[PDB]
Write a protein that binds this DNA or RNA. Sequence first.
RNA 1: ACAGGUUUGGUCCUGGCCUUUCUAUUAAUUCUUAAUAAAAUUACACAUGCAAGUAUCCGCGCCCCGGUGAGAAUGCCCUCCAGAUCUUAAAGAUCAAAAGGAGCAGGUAUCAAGCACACCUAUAACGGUAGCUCAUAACGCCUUGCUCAACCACACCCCCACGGGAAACAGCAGUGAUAAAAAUUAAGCCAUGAACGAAAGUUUGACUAAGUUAUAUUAAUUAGAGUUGGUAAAUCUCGUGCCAGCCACCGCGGUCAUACGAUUAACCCAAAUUAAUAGAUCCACGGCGUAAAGAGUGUUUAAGAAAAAAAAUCACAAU
RNA 2: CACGAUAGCUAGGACCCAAACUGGGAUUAGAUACCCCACUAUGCCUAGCCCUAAACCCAAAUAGUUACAUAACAAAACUA
RNA 3: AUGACCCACCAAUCACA
Lengths: 117, 69, 571
Amino acid sequence: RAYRGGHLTIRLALGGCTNRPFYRIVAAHSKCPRDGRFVEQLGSYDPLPNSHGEKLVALNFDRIRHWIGCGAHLSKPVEKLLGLSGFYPLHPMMITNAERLRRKRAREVLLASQKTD
Amino acid sequence: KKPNSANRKCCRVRLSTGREAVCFIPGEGHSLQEHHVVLVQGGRTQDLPGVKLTVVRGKYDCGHVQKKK
Amino acid sequence: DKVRKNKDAVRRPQADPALLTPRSPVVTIMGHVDHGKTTLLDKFRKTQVAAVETGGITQHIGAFLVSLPSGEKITFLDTPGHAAFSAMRARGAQVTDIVVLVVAADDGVMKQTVESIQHAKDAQVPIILAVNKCDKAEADPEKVKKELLAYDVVCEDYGGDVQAVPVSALTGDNLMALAEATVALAEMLELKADPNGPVEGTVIESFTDKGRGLVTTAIIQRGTLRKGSVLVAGKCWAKVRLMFDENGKTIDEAYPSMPVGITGWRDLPSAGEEILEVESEPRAREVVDWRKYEQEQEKGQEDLKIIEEKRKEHKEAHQKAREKYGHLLWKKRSILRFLERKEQIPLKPKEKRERDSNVLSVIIKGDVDGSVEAILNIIDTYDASHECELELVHFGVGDVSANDVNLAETFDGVIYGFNVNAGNVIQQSAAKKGVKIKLHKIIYRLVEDLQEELSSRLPCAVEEHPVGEASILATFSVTEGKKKVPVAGCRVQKGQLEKQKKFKLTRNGHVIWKGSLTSLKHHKDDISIVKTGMDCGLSLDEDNMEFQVGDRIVCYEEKQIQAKTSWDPGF
RNA sequence: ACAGGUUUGGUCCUGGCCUUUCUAUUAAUUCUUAAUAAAAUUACACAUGCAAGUAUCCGCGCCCCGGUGAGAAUGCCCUCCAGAUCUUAAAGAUCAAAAGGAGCAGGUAUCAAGCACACCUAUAACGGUAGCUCAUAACGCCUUGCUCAACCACACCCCCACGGGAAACAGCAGUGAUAAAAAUUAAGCCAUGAACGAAAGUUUGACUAAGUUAUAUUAAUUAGAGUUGGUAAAUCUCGUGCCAGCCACCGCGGUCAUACGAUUAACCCAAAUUAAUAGAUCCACGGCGUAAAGAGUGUUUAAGAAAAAAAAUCACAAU
RNA sequence: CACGAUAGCUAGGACCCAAACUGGGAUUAGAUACCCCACUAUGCCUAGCCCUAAACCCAAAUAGUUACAUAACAAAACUA
RNA sequence: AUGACCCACCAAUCACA
Ligand SMILES: Nc1nc2c(ncn2[C@@H]2O[C@H](COP(=O)(O)OP(=O)(O)OP(O)(O)=S)[C@@H](O)[C@H]2O)c(=O)[nH]1
Ligand SMILES: *C(=O)[C@H](CCSC)NC=O
Ligand SMILES: [Mg+2]
Ligand SMILES: [Mg+2]
Ligand SMILES: [Mg+2]
Ligand SMILES: [Mg+2]
Ligand SMILES: [Mg+2]
Ligand SMILES: [Mg+2]
Ligand SMILES: [Mg+2]
Ligand SMILES: [Mg+2]
Ligand SMILES: [Mg+2]
Ligand SMILES: [Mg+2]
Ligand SMILES: [Mg+2]
Ligand SMILES: [Mg+2]
Ligand SMILES: [Mg+2]
Ligand SMILES: [Mg+2]
Ligand SMILES: [Mg+2]
Ligand SMILES: [Mg+2]
Ligand SMILES: [Mg+2]
Ligand SMILES: [Mg+2]
Ligand SMILES: [Mg+2]
Ligand SMILES: [Mg+2]
Ligand SMILES: [Mg+2]
Ligand SMILES: [Mg+2]
Ligand SMILES: [Mg+2]
Ligand SMILES: [Mg+2]
Ligand SMILES: [Mg+2]
Ligand SMILES: [Mg+2]
Ligand SMILES: [Mg+2]
Ligand SMILES: [Mg+2]
Ligand SMILES: [Mg+2]
Ligand SMILES: [Mg+2]
Ligand SMILES: [Mg+2]
Ligand SMILES: [Mg+2]
Ligand SMILES: [Mg+2]
Ligand SMILES: [Mg+2]
Ligand SMILES: [Mg+2]
Ligand SMILES: [Mg+2]
Ligand SMILES: [Mg+2]
Ligand SMILES: [Mg+2]
Ligand SMILES: [Mg+2]
Ligand SMILES: [Mg+2]
Ligand SMILES: [Mg+2]
Ligand SMILES: [Mg+2]
Ligand SMILES: [Mg+2]
Ligand SMILES: [Mg+2]
Ligand SMILES: [Mg+2]
Ligand SMILES: [Mg+2]
Ligand code: NA
């Protein structure tokens, strides 16, 4: 439907069934509903690890860079996904959260050897 | 009607649609007075000419038929 | 093979000696009209409800929480004074620890004080006599004490345990002593409650708020009532959304003896119903279902008796009609069914057949359950069914709505509102449909209006009073228009005769005829009124009437007597 | 449709009605527990709480999401795109108003005419021709969301909203009324989405995870409902006696009732089972001497067929 | 668009004979019928209307075939 | 001139071990 403004975007639609999430990577208008109408389907991402302990991500790379090339915008989680794939540099926030995680493990290590005493 | 005879207990009801209509009461015996609310349904009674409705037994003021005591 | 499991909320067994906790007293304030119950209340609570109350009347029970200087928490119940509300008072007597019986000094013990005495005595409740209006000129505590001695209530002066505190409500005379009297009697009863267990309670008044839905005023007997519990009362249930207090406050917990407004009922509980908490929603529905099934069974049985009789009558008419008429075969029964041939039985299925018999169709819509019950008791009192018939088609809580209008429209009813509303739309709608909606804030105005209504429909009493008398002399046969007309020559003796009046003919004391003349004619002139001593010719419309030489004639006129209601409500 | 019952004393034909299948709502009767899905009487009126903020001030966001189906024969499909927005110099790209039209598009012709509904000139006016739509349905009237990754419309009412009625939940919950129709006045922003921010991040009744409900599936812990004359699987003994009652259709009940009511046995579905109502499906690529139907007659119009071979023409009572 | 049996309408003319209606006579329980007698509108001519029929050969028009082939009855069955 | 209504065909054996 006709909107006032808003941009083309690559995001995750959430399909799935209760407790079993699934995502359709999608190029959509920004102002339209999450699970709703879209411009083109790009990939899929299945968060739940499967029989082989893999999360399956699918990326139509050709079309993805066609749209990025038209100035579509990426969602933070799509950014995180591409980065993980190695099609984009790591997103700074991935790195930072990794570091924070490390420091938490450190302080729980020390707290563990402090409580054991 | 002619070929087969009895005398069938009916009532007249006024319906939520404001239309007033003859309606029939199933089962043997009943207690129904004016001002009782009933719930009526669509089955047409074959003997009675003109009577297209039926009281639902077991709802509001029409109780289920009491087994002989 | 299938026996329905009995599942219903049963009031829990008496609490163990260990868990019994200090309670708080519940006190009804009872008595005859205008003896000051509400003024007492007002003075305690620092509020004025005696000023704002409609008609200066107390028409509703209410509970009030009062804290005293000593730290005493007392729950007061304000009972109405009129004879109509005797149902209400009874309820008040059931929920109470103590009653304060208010008897004015200038009057003394009277009817409603007697009733109140009876309710409290029958409910086995400790009573405290408070004589009121001691700031008056004729104030006489002693008279009151004697009259109380008559009814087997023994004052503190005579050795009896009933405490007598003389008090002026206006000036606040002995209020400390009535307070301390209630305190002492309460410490004496040693009241206990169980805070820890589930909630047992009782409904005061149940009404419907437009914002909050179905609401009940209830005094917790025992148990802590917390938001989100599941209550069951009579045939209906609630989950508790709000529990609020009378000043509008939202209170998070309810402890035994506290009055609490409750929200979230699916249907309106009957005022005076005991409230039992249960474990879940499905449990509550199990319960409601059981209770309904039970009631439907009882009703079904009574109905079964009435029915069995009806169909045994019919069965007997069938046996008569068959055996008495000489059974042979069924075809020869068809042929011998011709011995009684003409069957005259007149039955009409129309709804206008009872209008001249003057039924009164009546719809009651009140503000609260208690009020409605009051009005329906007043209608139960109705004793004259040969005069009018009082038919209650529908009664219910809440303001006048579209359904009620329609209902009244079909039965030619009258809608009696009590402390309720009718919006614009409803009004214009009842204007179209020819229904009258009469709203009343004052219960006896309402009953007055009922009487007015009953009497206005009442059959007009017809009285025959005499006008004139004339003796026939000569009989003539006059030929006019090829028709021989019998003509009675008459001499008017006492009174006069008029053409429009009704006549009756008299033969030697018998009454031969009833009706009006065709032609009264006097000396070639038609004259409407013949005076005394006047000769008048008389030709009746009835040709079968024989006029002799010596007959008498009485001209009479019928005047209408307008009867009032044969029903006088006790109150 | 793989069909079946029912017109008659009977047979054939024609022709309706009904049965058998599948789904949904409601009701009755029954109901043990999980999971998943779905949640629906009301464009009537609404108490209370919450549903839009972010951010070093500006700004940017704030019916977008979410709601609803009131209105409108709306419209589907398809041209063509002004504008807004994003990106970048531009060029691109996303959403696409207005304007259009190959085609398709509810009922009603007992709505048959509409009444200015066309074009030219040229300068944008003066002026001039007398047209335009329509039985291939104009112009009316009634009913109505939809052709569904979605779309169209509405946003208290007066199509609109300057004004005027008047003081708005068709956001989430709730509540009155109303209806055969009954989910929590609940927890979180942890994930996705959205807004804003350079950013850590904040907000979000979107949503996520829960609560409620036999509405539907599935799994097992759960047994009850309907029926037993024929169609149509399945019955015995009493009671009743054209009564009381029963039936979808045919019909049953008049003293030997497998048809009522109850019992015994059985059949059939099963956490459901019946009933009621709406659907799905269903009419004619068939017919017109006697069954519904060849319009009392001929000519032309519009529209169609020409599909290979020829013809117009002579006793008698046309007008 | 132009016609369209009988009946019927309007106006003027005709009138032998027939004849709804009506009046008489029979018949009959009745007889506002059948049968008998009289007589009228009408049947006729001119002019205008009216537009209906069992207007039915209950079988549409135009070209064809006698192949396939019986619901029944009727006037055999069929193609475009 | 006449002559209530209602009437009909929807179940299968015997005999022996
Ligand atoms: N002189 C005097 N008048 C009093 C006293 N107490 C009350 N009254 C008066 O009596 C009147 C009735 O008082 P009220 O409070 O309405 O009595 P009530 O018993 O509640 O009345 P009701 O509800 O049964 S109708 C009031 O006008 C009040 O002024 C008193 O102690 N002395
Ligand atoms: C009539 O005219 C009347 C005669 C009756 S006396 C037998 N006289 C006067 O009115
Ligand atoms: Mg889901
Ligand atoms: Mg019969
Ligand atoms: Mg039925
Ligand atoms: Mg029930
Ligand atoms: Mg009072
Ligand atoms: Mg409810
Ligand atoms: Mg037939
Ligand atoms: Mg037959
Ligand atoms: Mg058939
Ligand atoms: Mg239900
Ligand atoms: Mg929507
Ligand atoms: Mg319209
Ligand atoms: Mg453009
Ligand atoms: Mg466009
Ligand atoms: Mg609509
Ligand atoms: Mg609008
Ligand atoms: Mg609204
Ligand atoms: Mg508007
Ligand atoms: Mg809501
Ligand atoms: Mg809003
Ligand atoms: Mg409600
Ligand atoms: Mg529902
Ligand atoms: Mg409920
Ligand atoms: Mg979030
Ligand atoms: Mg976030
Ligand atoms: Mg929240
Ligand atoms: Mg049955
Ligand atoms: Mg028997
Ligand atoms: Mg059967
Ligand atoms: Mg039976
Ligand atoms: Mg089920
Ligand atoms: Mg025919
Ligand atoms: Mg023809
Ligand atoms: Mg014809
Ligand atoms: Mg003609
Ligand atoms: Mg003629
Ligand atoms: Mg003439
Ligand atoms: Mg003549
Ligand atoms: Mg003749
Ligand atoms: Mg004659
Ligand atoms: Mg001529
Ligand atoms: Mg002919
Ligand atoms: Mg024909
Ligand atoms: Mg033709
Ligand atoms: Mg006869
Ligand atoms: Mg016969
Ligand atoms: Na007073």
